[PDB]
Design a protein around this ligand. Structure first.
Ligand SMILES: CCCCCCCCCCCCCCCCCC(=O)OC[C@H](COP(=O)(O)OCCN)OC(=O)CCCCCCCCCCCCCCCCC
Ligand SMILES: CCCCCCCCCCCCCCCCCC(=O)OC[C@H](COP(=O)(O)OCCN)OC(=O)CCCCCCCCCCCCCCCCC
Ligand SMILES: CCCCCCCCCCCCO[C@@H]1O[C@H](CO)[C@@H](O[C@H]2O[C@H](CO)[C@@H](O)[C@H](O)[C@H]2O)[C@H](O)[C@H]1O
Ligand SMILES: CCCCCCCCCCCCO[C@@H]1O[C@H](CO)[C@@H](O[C@H]2O[C@H](CO)[C@@H](O)[C@H](O)[C@H]2O)[C@H](O)[C@H]1O
Ligand SMILES: CCCCCCCCCCCCO[C@@H]1O[C@H](CO)[C@@H](O[C@H]2O[C@H](CO)[C@@H](O)[C@H](O)[C@H]2O)[C@H](O)[C@H]1O
Ligand SMILES: CCCCCCCCCCCCO[C@@H]1O[C@H](CO)[C@@H](O[C@H]2O[C@H](CO)[C@@H](O)[C@H](O)[C@H]2O)[C@H](O)[C@H]1O
Ligand SMILES: *C(=O)CCCCCCCCCCCCC
Lengths: 172, 171, 181, 122, 86, 114, 19, 155, 12, 459, 121, 106, 67
C-alpha cells in the first residue's frame, strides 16, 4: 500500500472510532468507550520495534474486522450514503452555455458579459500554462499527479479551468 | 329497443320500491335530482337538437345479402372457378360463425353479472347453450391451421363422419 | 421538537400494531382470529403470530430511537414542521388512521360468516403477543443505554444483512447470467 | 386447542377426525331426533343474492339484517339489533357443531371401552 | 439548509476547538498549528477532524484530512466543498 | 478470530492481506513505477481536456483496444447440446399430448382459440 | 471521421502476380 | 489509431511480452495475457476480476462514475463490473457462511411447513351444515336428477 | 442572492 | 399496383432534374405524397384479397408491409442528408436513386402474384442494398460486410430458384391464387425433405434464423443509417413474408421439419437477448436485438395457427418501426461523438432532455409495454405457442425478462449516470432529428387505437 | 402471461365474467401463474428484495408506492380471482405458506435496520 | 504532515479564482431580462368544477346515454336485491314476508 | 424566516403545532376509550365459549356401555 505505517494506524483509528460510534449510538456511551479505545492506541504509541509495531497493527486490523458494525453509519453525501450523487443529474457543464440561442443569452446580458471575460482569461493564459509545465516536468514525464503553482505575477496556476469553473454542489 | 331483444334477451327488471326506516334524508335522492337537472336536462336538449338536424336529412344503408352458391363438395377437382366461389362462401360462413360464438359468449357474460351471487344456478341455460355452440364450432373449424380452407374443413368432417360410422357399426 | 410529527407517528405505530379500535385493528384483529380458528398449517399460523409480535418490536424501535432520548443530530438546529401543506396532508391521514377502519367496517355489506365463537385465549391472541412485543422491545431498547460492549451474534448479522439473500443472489445470479455468453 | 395435543401426541383412535366425522349414525343413542328447520326458502335466499356460504341455517336472520341495512341508509350505525340477532344465531350454530365433535369423541371413548371389554373377555 | 459564510464557518470551527480539553482556548487562533503551537499529536489531529465532520455533517477523506494542520486550513477546506465565497 | 475466507464474488480486504504489509524496496519501486505511468497518462489526458480550443472527443486508445478486442471473436450453451436437450422435451411433450387427443382423453371442451 | 478509402498498403494487395 | 496500437495474437517471446505490455500501458512485470487456448483473447491483459465498486471513491478519476482513468487498460469484463452490475467487494461475513445460514434457514422453513401440513391446526367442531341437500340446486346441480337428501338434526 | 442556473439550451 | 410503381419511378426524374439545393426537399416532399396514397391499399375484404391484375395483388399481409415500405423512404432521406452533406452532387443523386430503386423492387416484391416474379424482385433488392453498404459505408469492414450479405443470401436463394421451377413443372403454375386451390399434400420422402429445405432456407437467412444470423451484425455495424433503416425495417421482413406464403404448399411436412428450426429459434432468442447484455457496440446491440425479435416470428410462422400468424404479422410491423427508430437514435449520437461504443457517451439525458424522451419511448416499445403493437404481436405468439406446447411458456417468459434487462440497460448506460467530462461537442438536438423520431413513434403508437389493420389476413 | 395463456386456451376468454361462470375445476396451472405474478408485485419471499431497494426514490414515491398503488396489486389480483382459489385447497396452502414466511422474514429483518425508510419498507 | 509550501500556494491561487467565479454566478438586479379572499377562491373553484367536472360529465353522459347504452350488453347491472316484504315498482307486486321465526333469543 | 434556526439549542415552536398535536392525541384516546365502553366485546369476545365436558351423555346421546 502507498500508505506509510503512520498513515495506516491513523486510518484504522478513525475507522475504528466510527464503527464504535455505530455500536454505541448514545453519545455518553460512545464517549466512555472512545476513551478506552484511545487508551489502547496510546499504550503502544512509543513502540520502537517496527516488527512489533507492524504485528500490533495487523492484529488490530483483524480485531476490527471481527468487531465491525455490519451496517455502519455513513454521512448522507459520502460514498454509499443515501444522498451520494443525488445531485449529479442537476450538474450541467459550463460549455453548454455556448450552445444557447441568442434569445436565451439575451435574458442574462450581464452574466454573459462576465462569462466572456473568463473565456478571454482562459484563452490568454493557456499558452503560458502549457509552457510552465513543459519546463518543470522532469525528462520522461511526471512522476506524480501534483501540479505546480504559478510563479510570476499575472500567471494563473497551470490547469485551473475545470477546477475553478466546476459545477456547484447544489447547482439548482 | 334499439337492438333485437330476442338476440340479446334480458329478464324483466324488478327494482324494490324505497322503504326508508330512517328520519334522515337519503343523499342519493338529492344527488339524483341534481344530476337530472344539471346533467340530464342539458344533455337531452343538445341531443334533441341533433336529432332534429338528422330528421331533415334521412338516407338509408342496407345489410348486404349474399346469394348461396354450390359448396366445395360439389366442385370438380382442380376446378378453380367453382372452387373459388365455394371458398369465398365458406370464408364468409366462417366469419359469421365466429360472431355467433361471440353473441352466445356475450349472453353468458351478461348473465353472470346480472344474476350476481346466484349466477351458478340462474345462468344454467346460457351456460348450456354456450357449451353446445362451442362444441359445434370446434367440430367445424378447430385444428384446420393457418392455411385453412373449405377443402381442409371437408377433409376434417369426412374423417369425423367415418369415425362415427364405425361407432354405429360397432354397436 | 416535532410535536405534530410525533403525534402522527405514535398514532401510526399504534394503528400498525393493532391497537384496539384504530384503523388497523378492524382488519388485523379479524384476520388473526380467522387464522387461528381455521383448518390451517400449524407452522404458518405460528409464524404469523410471531411476526405480529415483531411488528411491535420494530415499531418501538422507530419511536424509541427517533423521538425519545437525547438529540443525536448535528449542532445547527433546523427543525421546522410548520408548513400548512405538511400539517394538512398528515392531518387528513391522521384522521383516516383513527376512524377509517371503523367507517369502512360498518358500511361494507357482509359477504362471509365471521367466526365469533372461540376460546378466550384464541380471541385475545393478537393483543397479547403485541403487548409482549412492546414489553420485550422496550427492555432491549433500554438495554442499549448500558455501558456494555458486545459482539454481534450470527443472528444479529443475519437480520441486519437481510438474510444474505441480496448479498448472495444479487452477485451470483447476475454473474452467472452475464458470464453465460 | 388441547384436542390437537391429545390426538397428535396422544391416542388418535379416540379423537374425532375433522375431515371424516360424523363416523356414527345420526340416531345412534338418540330416540327420534328432530330435523333442523330452515326458515328461509330457496327463493328468498336467491332473490336476496346471498353468498352461497351465507345460505346456511341462519340465513333468515341475515336477510332481515340486510334489508334493515338498506332501509336505514345513510345511518350506517343502525341495525344494531338485527346484526346481533344474526351473529347470535351463528354462535348457536357453531355451538351445535361443538356438540357434534364432543358426541363423536365420547362415542369413540365408548367404542374403545367396548372393544377393550370384549378383548380381555375373549 | 440555511447557507454558510466564511465568518460563520470560522466561528464554528473555533467553537468546536474551544470545547476540546487538550487545547488552550486562549492560545487558540485561526493560524495555530495543531502540532507546533498547540502541542497535539497525530492521534489528536484525527479526533479534531472527526469533530469537524460531526459539526458540519460531511466526511473529510483521510487523504485530505491529514493535511489540515491549522484551523484556517480546515475553514478553507470546508468553504471549498460547500462553495462558500462570501 | 476466524480468518477471512475469500470467494470469487467476495474479495479479500486490503487490511487483511499480508502482501500489503512487509514493505520491500522492490514493491515500493514497483508502486513508484505504476504511479509514474498513471501520472504520464494523466498529463496526456489533461493537456487535451484543459485545452481552450478543443471541441470534440478525446479518443482513448484504451477504449478502442477494449471494444476491438471484444467484437473480434465472433465465432455447452452454444452448440447442438442445448438444442438436442430442448428437442426431446418438446417432442416428448407434444407426443404425449397428441396421443391423448386421439384417445379423446384430453379435455378441450372450450378450446377454440389456437 | 471521414469515410475510409483504400490506401497504398491496401492497393498493393492487388499488384502482385497472384492474389 | 494506428494498427500497431490494437490488440494482436498471443505473445510468445519475452520481447513479444515486452511490446504487448507497452502497448497496453502496463509494467512488463504486471502484464499477463490470458492463457493461450484458442478462446480468442489474444494479447489482451488479464486484469484482476475486481468490481469497479472496489476502487477508491475519493480519488479524482477521469470517469468518476466508472472509476476509470483515461488510458488505463480496461478489464475484459468491464461491462460486467460497472457499479450497476456485479459487485465483488468484501463482505462482513464469510461467503461460505452466508450460503450455509441462508440455505439452512430456507431448508428448515420448508421442513416445518411440511410438518404443519401433516399436522394441521383446527378447532373442535363438526362440519358446517347447509340446508336443502347441501345446497344442491344453488351449486349448479342438475335439477332433473333427484339427489340423495342430506339430513341434519338438532343437538 | 439569486444564482445563475446552468442548463442546456431549451430553445431548440 | 401501377398507381404506386409509376409514381415511385417518377421520383428518379424528379431527383435528377431538381435544382442542386432542392434534391432533399423535392424527393422527401413527393415520397411523402406517395406514402399518403398508399392508404388506398386498405380496401380489404373478409373473404377475397385485392387482386388488381395478373401480375400484382394485395391482401392483408402485404398491405401493412407496403405502407411500411413507402413510409420509410421519406424517413431515410431525412436520416441521410446530414452525413452526405459534403458528398459530390451527382453521388448524392445516385444515393437517392438507390433508395428509390429499393422501394420500387420492394413494393413489387410484396404484391407479386407469381412466385418466380417474387423471386426475381426478392433477389433484386440485393443490388441496391449491397451498393449502399459498400459505397457509402464509412469503414474498411464495409467490403467484407458486403460479401457476407451477398453470399449468405445467394447460398439460400439459388436452391430456392431450383425448387420453385421444379414446383411449376409438376403443378403447372406458381401463381399464388392458383396454388391455394391446386395445392397437394407433401408426403414423407428424402426428396420432399430437400424440397422443403430449399423452399425455406432462403427465407430463414433473411429473417435471420439463429445460426445463420452472423451476417446481420456485420452489415448493420458497417452500413450507413439509411442502409440500417431499410435493412432492419423491411428487408428482414422479406423472409417472414416469403415463409408466410410458401408454407401453404409445404403441409403436412412442416409438422416435423419445423422442429429443428423451432429449437434454434426458441433457444436462439434466449441467447441473442443475453448477448445484448454484453454488447459494447450500440449498433451491434440493436442488430442482435432484431435476431431475438425475429426468432419469435419464425416460431409463429412454423406452428401455423390463426393466432400465430396474427401475432407474427403484428411483430413484423411493430419491430420494423421500433428497430428503425433505435438505429436513428444511435445515429444521432454517432453524428456527434463519431463512435458506436455504447459506454463512451453517458448521462446524455442531462444534455439532450428531449432526445432522452425519444430514447425512453423507443426502449419501452422494444420491451413490448402494453398496449403497444409490439406487445400485441408478441403476446399473440406466446398464447399460440403455449397451446403448441405448454413448456414453451418458460422460454417465452425468460426472454421477456432478458429483453427488459438489456432494453433499459441501453437506456441507463447512454442516458443516465454522469456525463462524460471530455465530450464537449453535444450540440442541441436539431429539428430534423426530433422530427425523425416523432415520425417513427407517433404512427407506432397510433396503431394501438386500431390494430386490426396490422393483424394480417387471418384477422 | 401463464394465466392469460391458460384461460385463453381452456376457457376461450380473458374476461372475468366468463372465467367465473365456466368455473374450471382444474385450476392448478392458471392459479400458480397468478400466484407467481403476485409474488413479484407484492414482494413475497423469493422476489422480495426489490421493495426495500425501492427506497432510493423520493419519500413521496415510497409513500404512494407502498400504500395505494403498486405493492398491493399483487394481493388485489388474487382477490379478484377468489371464486377460483376458494375451490382450490392446493393454491390456498401455497399462498398461506408463502405469506407466512414473507411476514416473518421481513419483520425479522426490520428488527435491526437503522434506515428509517427501510424499516417502514 | 500538512501541505508543502507549493501545495499550499497552489490552493491559495485556485481559491482566489474559484471564489471570484462563484461571485460571478450571481444575477444582477435586472436579470433575467424577460420580454414583453373567498370571493377569488370561490371563483377559482367554480371554474375548475365547471371545466373539469361539469363539461366532462356532460360529455360522458351524452356518450353513455346515446352511444354506449344503445348497444346490447354494454352496461350490465347486477340485478337489485329483493327482500321479503319488498314491493316491485315495475309490476306493483308484493313479496311475501318470511315465516314465523322459532324465536330463540338472547 | 418565520422560524429562525438555532445552534445547540431546543428549536422554536409555534402555538398551532403544539395545540393541534395535543388535540389530535387526545382525540385518539377519547376514541379508544369511548369504544371500549361500547364495543368491549370486540376485544374480549362476544359470546361465551362452552366447556364441552360439562355436557351430559343425555344431551349428546351417548348410550350406556352395556348395550
Ligand atoms: C416463489 C418464487 C420465488 C423464486 C425465487 C428464486 C429466484 C431468486 C433469484 C432472483 C434473481 C436474482 C438476481 C437479481 C439481481 C438484481 O436484483 O440486480 C441487482 C444487482 C445489484 O443490486 P444490489 O444487490 O441491490 O446492489 C446495489 C448496491 N451496491 O444488479 C445487477 O447486477 C443486475 C444487473 C445485471 C443484469 C443481470 C441479469 C440477471 C439475470 C438472471 C436473473 C434471472 C433472469 C430471468 C430467468 C429466471 C426467470 C424464470
Ligand atoms: C453446394 C451444392 C453442391 C452439392 C450438391 C447439391 C445437391 C445435393 C443435395 C440434393 C438435393 C435433393 C435432390 O437432389 O433431390 C432431387 C429430386 C429428384 O426427384 P425427381 O426425379 O425430380 O422427382 C421424382 C422423384 N422420384 O428433386 C425433387 O424431387 C424435388 C427437388 C426440389 C428442389 C431441391 C433443391 C435442392 C436443395 C439443396 C440445398 C438445400 C439446403 C440449402 C442450404 C442453404 C444454406 C443457407
Ligand atoms: C421461530 C424462529 C423462526 C426462524 C428459525 C430459523 C432457524 C434457521 C436455522 C439454520 C441454521 C443454519 O446455520 C448453522 O449455524 C451454525 C453456526 O455457525 C453453522 O456452523 C458453522 O459455523 C462454525 C464455523 O464457522 C462451526 O460451528 C461450523 O463448522 C460451521 O458449519 C452451521 O454450518 C449452519 O448450518
Ligand atoms: C452459413 C450459410 C452461408 C455461408 C456462406 C459462406 C460463404 C463465404 C462468405 C464470405 C466470403 C468472404 O471471402 C473472404 O473471407 C475472409 C474471411 O472469411 C475475409 O478475410 C478476412 O478473414 C480472414 C480469415 O478469417 C483473414 O485472414 C483476413 O485478414 C480478413 O480480411 C476476406 O476479406 C473475404 O473476402
Ligand atoms: C435442418 C435439418 C433438418 C433435418 C430433418 C430430418 C427429417 C428426417 C425425415 C425422415 C423421413 C424420410 O422419409 C422416409 O424414408 C423413405 C424414403 O426414402 C421412405 O421409405 C421408402 O424408402 C425406404 C428406404 O429405406 C424403404 O424402406 C421403404 O420401403 C420406402 O417406402 C419412408 O417411408 C419415409 O418416411
Ligand atoms: C372529543 C375529542 C377530544 C377533545 C379534547 C381536545 C383536547 C384539548 C385541546 C387543547 C389541548 C391543549 O393542550 C395543552 O396545551 C398547552 C399549550 O402548549 C400545553 O402546554 C405546553 O406548552 C405550553 C407552552 O410552553 C406550556 O403550558 C407548557 O410548557 C407545556 O406543557 C399542555 O401540555 C397541553 O395539555
Ligand atoms: C387449538 O384450539 C388450536 C389453536 C392453534 C394455535 C393458536 C395459538 C394460541 C396459544 C395459546 C396460549 C396463550 C398465549 C396468548
Amino acid at each position: 500500500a502507498y500508505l506509510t505505517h503512520q498513515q495506516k494506524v491513523l486510518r484504522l483509528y478513525k475507522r475504528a472510532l466510527r464503527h464504535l460510534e455505530s455500536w454505541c449510538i448514545h453519545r455518553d456511551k460512545y464517549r466512555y468507550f472512545a476513551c478506552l479505545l484511545r487508551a489502547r492506541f496510546d499504550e503502544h504509541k512509543n513502540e520502537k520495534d517496527m516488527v512489533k509495531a507492524t504485528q500490533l497493527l495487523r492484529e488490530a486490523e483483524e480485531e476490527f474486522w471481527h468487531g465491525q458494525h455490519p451496517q455502519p453509519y455513513i454521512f448522507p453525501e459520502s460514498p454509499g450514503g443515501t444522498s451520494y450523487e443525488r445531485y449529479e443529474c442537476y450538474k450541467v457543464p459550463e460549455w453548454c452555455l455556448d450552445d444557447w440561442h441568442p434569445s436565451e443569452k439575451a435574458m442574462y446580458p450581464d452574466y454573459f458579459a462576465k462569462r466572456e471575460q473568463w473565456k478571454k482569461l482562459r484563452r490568454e493564459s493557456w499558452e503560458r500554462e502549457v509552457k510552465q509545465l513543459q519546463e518543470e516536468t522532469p525528462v520522461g514525464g511526471p512522476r506524480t499527479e501534483a501540479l505546480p503553482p504559478a510563479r510570476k505575477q499575472g500567471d494563473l496556476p497551470p490547469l485551473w479551468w475545470h477546477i475553478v469553473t466546476r459545477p456547484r454542489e447544489r447547482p439548482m | 329497443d334499439s337492438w333485437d331483444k330476442d338476440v340479446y334477451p334480458e329478464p324483466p327488471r324488478r327494482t324494490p320500491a324505497p322503504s326508508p326506516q330512517t328520519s334522515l334524508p337519503n343523499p342519493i335522492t338529492y344527488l339524483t335530482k341534481a344530476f337530472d337537472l344539471l346533467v340530464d336536462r342539458p344533455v337531452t336538449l343538445v341531443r334533441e337538437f341533433i336529432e332534429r338536424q338528422h330528421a331533415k336529412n334521412k338516407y338509408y344503408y342496407y345489410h348486404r345479402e349474399f346469394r348461396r352458391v354450390p359448396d366445395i363438395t360439389e366442385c370438380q377437382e382442380k376446378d378453380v372457378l367453382c372452387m373459388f366461389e365455394a371458398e369465398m362462401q365458406w370464408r364468409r360462413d366462417y366469419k359469421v360463425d365466429q360472431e355467433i360464438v361471440n353473441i352466445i359468449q356475450e349472453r353468458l357474460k351478461a348473465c353472470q353479472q346480472r344474476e350476481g351471487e346466484s349466477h351458478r344456478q340462474n345462468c344454467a341455460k346460457e351456460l348450456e347453450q354456450f357449451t353446445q355452440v362451442v362444441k359445434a364450432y370446434q367440430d367445424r373449424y378447430h385444428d384446420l391451421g393457418a392455411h385453412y380452407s373449405a377443402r381442409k374443413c371437408l377433409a376434417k368432417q369426412k374423417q369425423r363422419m367415418l369415425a362415427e360410422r364405425k361407432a354405429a357399426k360397432e354397436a | 421538537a416535532m410535536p405534530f410529527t410525533t403525534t402522527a407517528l405514535i398514532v401510526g405505530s399504534l394503528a400498525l400494531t393493532g391497537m384496539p379500535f384504530l384503523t388497523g385493528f378492524y382488519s388485523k384483529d379479524l384476520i388473526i382470529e380467522a387464522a387461528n380458528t381455521s383448518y390451517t398449517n400449524a407452522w404458518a399460523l405460528l409464524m404469523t403470530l410471531i411476526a405480529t409480535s415483531f411488528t411491535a418490536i420494530y415499531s418501538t424501535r422507530i419511536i424509541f430511537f427517533a423521538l425519545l432520548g437525547q438529540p443525536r443530530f448535528p449542532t445547527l438546529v433546523n427543525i421546522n414542521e410548520n408548513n400548512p401543506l405538511l400539517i394538512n396532508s398528515i392531518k387528513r391521514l391522521l384522521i383516516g388512521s383513527l376512524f377509517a377502519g371503523y367507517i369502512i367496517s360498518n358500511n361494507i355489506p357482509p359477504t362471509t360468516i365471521p367466526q365469533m365463537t372461540m376460546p378466550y385465549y384464541l380471541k385475545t391472541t393478537a393483543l397479547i403477543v403485541t403487548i409482549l412485543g412492546f414489553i420485550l422491545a422496550l427492555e432491549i431498547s433500554n438495554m442499549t443505554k448500558n455501558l456494555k460492549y458486545h459482539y454481534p451474534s450470527n443472528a444479529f448479522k443475519f437480520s441486519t444483512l437481510l438474510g444474505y439473500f441480496p448479498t448472495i443472489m444479487h452477485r451470483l445470479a447476475p454473474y452467472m447470467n452475464l458470464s453465460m455468453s | 386447542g388441547a384436542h390437537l395435543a391429545r390426538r397428535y401426541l396422544g391416542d388418535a383412535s379416540v379423537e374425532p377426525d375433522p375431515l371424516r366425522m360424523p363416523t356414527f349414525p345420526p340416531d345412534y343413542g338418540f330416540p327420534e331426533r328432530k330435523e333442523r328447520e330452515m326458515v328461509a326458502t330457496q327463493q328468498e335466499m336467491n332473490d336476496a343474492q346471498l353468498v352461497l356460504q351465507q345460505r346456511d341455517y341462519c340465513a333468515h336472520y341475515l336477510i332481515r339484517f340486510l334489508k334493515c341495512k338498506r332501509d336505514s341508509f345513510p345511518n350506517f350505525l343502525a341495525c344494531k339489533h338485527e346484526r346481533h340477532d344474526w351473529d347470535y344465531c351463528e354462535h348457536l350454530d357453531y355451538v351445535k357443531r361443538m356438540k357434534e365433535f364432543e358426541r363423536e369423541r365420547r362415542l369413540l371413548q365408548r367404542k374403545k371401552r367396548r372393544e377393550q371389554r370384549e378383548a380381555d373377555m375373549a | 439548509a440555511p447557507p454558510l459564510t466564511l465568518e460563520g464557518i470560522k466561528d464554528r470551527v473555533l467553537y468546536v476547538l474551544k470545547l476540546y480539553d487538550k487545547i488552550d482556548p486562549e492560545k487558540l487562533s485561526v493560524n495555530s498549528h495543531f502540532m507546533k503551537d498547540l502541542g497535539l499529536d497525530s492521534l489528536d489531529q484525527v479526533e479534531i477532524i472527526m469533530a469537524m465532520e460531526d459539526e458540519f455533517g460531511f466526511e473529510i477523506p483521510d487523504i485530505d484530512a491529514e493535511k489540515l494542520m491549522c484551523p484556517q486550513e480546515i475553514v478553507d477546506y470546508i468553504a471549498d466543498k460547500k462553495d462558500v465565497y462570501e | 478470530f476466524p480468518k477471512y475466507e475469500a470467494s470469487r464474488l467476495s474479495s479479500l480486504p486490503t487490511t487483511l492481506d499480508p502482501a500489503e504489509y512487509d514493505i520491500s524496496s522492490e514493491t515500493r519501486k514497483a508502486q513508484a513505477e505504476r504511479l509514474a505511468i498513471r501520472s504520464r497518462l494523466k498529463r496526456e489526458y489533461q493537456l487535451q481536456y484543459y485545452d481552450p480550443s478543443r471541441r470534440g472527443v478525446i479518443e482513448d486508445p484504451a477504449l478502442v483496444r477494449w471494444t476491438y478486442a471484444r467484437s473480434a471473436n465472433i465465432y455447452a450453451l452454444f452448440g447442438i447440446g442445448p438444442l438436442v436437450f430442448w428437442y426431446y422435451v418438446f417432442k416428448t411433450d407434444r407426443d404425449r399430448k397428441e396421443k391423448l387427443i386421439q384417445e379423446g382423453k384430453l379435455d378441450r371442451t372450450f378450446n377454440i382459440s389456437y | 471521421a471521414r469515410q475510409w478509402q483504400p490506401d497504398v498498403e491496401w492497393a498493393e494487395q492487388y499488384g502482385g502476380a497472384v492474389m | 489509431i494506428t494498427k500497431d496500437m490494437l490488440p494482436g495474437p498471443y505473445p510468445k517471446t519475452p520481447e513479444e511480452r515486452a511490446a504487448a505490455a507497452k502497448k497496453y500501458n502496463m509494467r512488463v512485470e504486471d502484464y499477463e495475457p490470458y492463457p493461450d487456448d484458442g478462446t480468442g483473447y489474444g494479447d489482451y491483459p488479464k486484469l484482476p476480476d475486481r468490481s469497479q465498486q472496489e476502487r477508491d471513491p475519493w480519488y479524482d478519476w477521469d470517469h468518476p462514475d466508472l472509476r476509470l482513468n483515461w488510458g488505463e487498460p480496461m478489464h475484459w469484463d468491464l461491462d460486467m463490473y460497472i457499479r450497476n452490475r456485479v459487485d465483488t467487494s468484501p463482505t462482513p461475513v464469510n461467503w461460505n457462511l452466508m450460503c450455509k445460514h441462508l440455505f439452512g434457514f430456507v431448508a428448515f422453513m420448508l421442513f416445518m411447513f411440511w410438518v404443519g401440513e401433516t399436522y394441521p391446526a383446527y378447532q373442535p367442531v363438526g362440519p358446517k351444515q347447509y340446508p336443502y341437500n347441501n345446497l344442491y340446486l344453488e351449486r349448479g346441480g342438475d335439477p332433473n336428477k333427484e339427489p340423495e337428501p342430506v339430513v341434519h338434526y338438532e343437538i | 442572492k439569486r444564482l445563475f442556473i446552468i442548463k442546456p439550451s431549451g430553445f431548440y | 399496383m401501377l398507381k404506386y410503381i409509376i409514381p415511385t419511378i417518377m421520383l428518379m426524374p424528379l431527383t435528377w432534374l431538381s435544382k442542386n439545393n432542392m434534391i432533399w426537399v423535392n424527393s422527401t416532399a413527393h415520397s411523402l405524397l406517395i406514402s399518403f396514397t398508399s392508404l388506398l391499399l386498405m380496401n380489404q375484404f373478409g373473404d377475397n384479397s385485392l387482386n388488381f391484375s395478373l401480375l400484382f395483388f394485395s391482401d392483408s399481409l402485404s398491405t401493412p408491409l407496403l405502407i411500411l415500405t413507402m413510409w420509410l423512404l421519406p424517413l431515410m432521406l431525412m436520416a441521410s442528408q446530414h452525413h452526405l452533406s459534403k458528398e459530390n452532387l451527382t453521388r448524392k443523386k445516385l444515393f437517392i436513386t438507390m433508395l428509390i430503386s429499393l422501394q420500387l423492387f420492394l413494393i413489387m416484391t410484396f404484391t407479386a402474384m407469381e412466385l418466380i416474379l417474387f423471386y426475381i424482385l426478392f433477389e433484386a433488392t440485393l443490388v441496391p442494398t449491397l451498393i449502399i453498404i459498400t459505397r457509402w459505408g464509412n469503414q474498411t469492414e464495409r467490403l467484407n460486410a458486403g460479401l457476407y450479405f451477398l453470399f449468405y443470401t445467394l447460398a439460400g436463394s439459388l436452391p430456392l430458384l431450383v425448387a420453385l421451377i421444379y414446383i411449376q413443372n409438376t403443378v403447372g403454375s406458381l401463381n399464388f391464387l392458383m396454388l391455394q386451390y391446386w395445392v397437394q399434400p407433401v408426403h414423407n420422402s428424402w426428396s420432399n425433405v430437400f424440397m422443403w429445405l430449399a423452399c425455406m432456407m432462403a427465407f430463414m437467412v433473411k429473417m435471420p434464423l439463429y445460426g445463420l444470423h452472423l451476417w446481420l451484425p456485420k452489415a448493420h455495424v458497417e452500413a450507413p443509417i439509411a442502409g440500417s433503416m431499410v435493412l432492419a425495417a423491411v428487408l428482414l421482413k422479406l423472409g417472414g413474408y416469403g415463409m408466410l406464403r410458401i408454407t401453404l404448399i409445404l403441409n403436412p411436412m412442416t409438422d416435423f421439419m419445423a422442429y429443428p428450426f423451432i429449437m434454434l429459434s426458441l433457444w436462439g432468442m434466449i441467447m441473442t437477448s443475453s448477448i445484448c447484455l454484453r454488447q459494447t457496440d450500440l449498433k451491434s446491440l440493436i442488430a442482435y436485438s432484431s435476431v431475438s425479435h425475429m426468432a419469435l416470428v419464425i416460431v409463429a410462422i412454423l406452428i401455423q395457427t390463426p393466432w400465430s400468424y396474427m401475432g407474427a404479422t403484428a411483430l413484423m410491423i411493430a419491430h420494423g418501426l421500433t428497430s428503425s427508430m433505435l438505429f436513428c437514435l444511435a445515429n444521432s449520437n454517432y453524428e456527434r461523438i463519431h463512435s458506436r461504443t455504447m459506454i463512451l457517451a453517458r448521462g446524455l439525458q442531462t444534455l439532450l432532455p428531449l432526445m432522452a424522451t425519444w430514447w425512453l419511448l423507443a426502449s419501452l416499445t422494444n420491451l413490448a409495454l402494453p398496449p403497444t403493437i409490439n406487445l400485441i404481436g408478441e403476446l399473440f405468439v406466446v398464447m399460440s405457442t403455449f397451446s403448441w406446447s405448454n413448456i414453451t411458456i418458460i422460454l417465452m417468459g425468460v426472454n421477456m425478462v432478458i429483453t427488459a434487462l438489456y432494453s433499459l440497460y441501453m437506456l441507463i448506460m447512454t442516458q443516465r449516470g454522469k456525463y462524460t467530462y471530455h465530450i464537449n461537442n453535444i450540440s442541441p438536438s436539431f429539428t430534423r432529428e426530433n422530427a425523425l423520431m416523432s415520425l417513427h413513434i407517433l404512427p407506432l403508437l397510433l396503431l394501438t387505437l386500431n390494430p386490426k389493420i396490422i393483424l394480417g389476413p387471418l384477422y | 402471461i401463464l394465466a392469460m395463456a391458460w384461460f385463453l386456451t381452456n376457457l376461450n376468454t380473458w374476461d372475468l365474467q366468463q372465467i367465473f361462470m365456466l368455473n374450471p375445476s382444474d385450476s392448478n396451472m392458471p392459479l400458480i401463474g397468478l400466484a407467481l405474478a403476485a409474488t413479484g408485485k407484492s414482494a413475497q419471499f423469493g422476489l422480495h428484495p426489490w421493495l426495500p431497494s425501492a427506497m432510493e426514490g423520493p419519500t413521496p414515491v415510497s409513500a404512494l408506492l407502498h400504500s395505494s398503488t403498486m405493492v398491493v396489486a399483487g394481493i388485489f389480483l388474487l382477490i379478484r380471482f377468489y371464486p377460483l382459489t376458494e375451490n382450490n385447497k392446493y393454491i390456498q396452502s401455497i399462498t398461506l405458506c408463502l405469506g407466512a414466511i414473507t411476514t416473518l422474514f421481513t419483520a425479522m429483518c426490520a428488527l435491526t435496520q437503522n434506515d428509517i425508510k427501510k424499516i417502514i419498507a | 504532515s500538512g501541505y508543502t509550501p507549493e501545495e499550499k500556494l497552489r490552493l491559495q491561487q485556485l481559491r482566489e479564482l474559484r471564489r471570484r467565479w462563484l461571485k460571478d454566478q450571481e444575477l444582477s438586479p435586472r436579470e433575467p431580462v424577460l420580454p414583453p379572499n373567498v370571493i377569488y377562491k370561490t371563483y377559482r373553484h367554480s371554474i375548475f368544477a365547471f371545466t373539469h367536472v361539469l363539461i366532462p360529465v356532460w360529455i360522458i353522459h351524452y356518450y353513455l346515454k346515446y352511444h354506449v347504452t344503445t348497444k346490447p350488453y354494454t352496461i350490465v347491472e347486477k340485478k337489485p336485491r329483493i327482500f321479503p316484504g319488498d314491493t316491485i315498482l315495475e309490476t306493483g307486486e308484493v313479496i311475501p314476508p318470511m315465516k314465523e321465526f322459532p324465536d330463540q333469543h338472547h | 424566516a418565520h422560524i429562525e434556526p438555532r445552534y445547540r439549542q431546543f428549536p422554536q415552536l409555534t402555538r398551532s403545532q403544539v395545540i393541534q398535536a395535543e388535540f389530535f392525541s387526545a382525540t385518539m384516546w377519547f376514541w379508544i376509550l369511548w369504544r371500549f365502553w361500547h364495543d368491549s366485546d370486540a376485544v374480549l369476545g362476544h359470546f361465551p365459549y362452552p366447556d364441552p365436558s360439562q355436557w351430559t351423555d343425555e344431551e349428546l346421546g351417548i348410550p350406556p356401555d352395556d348395550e
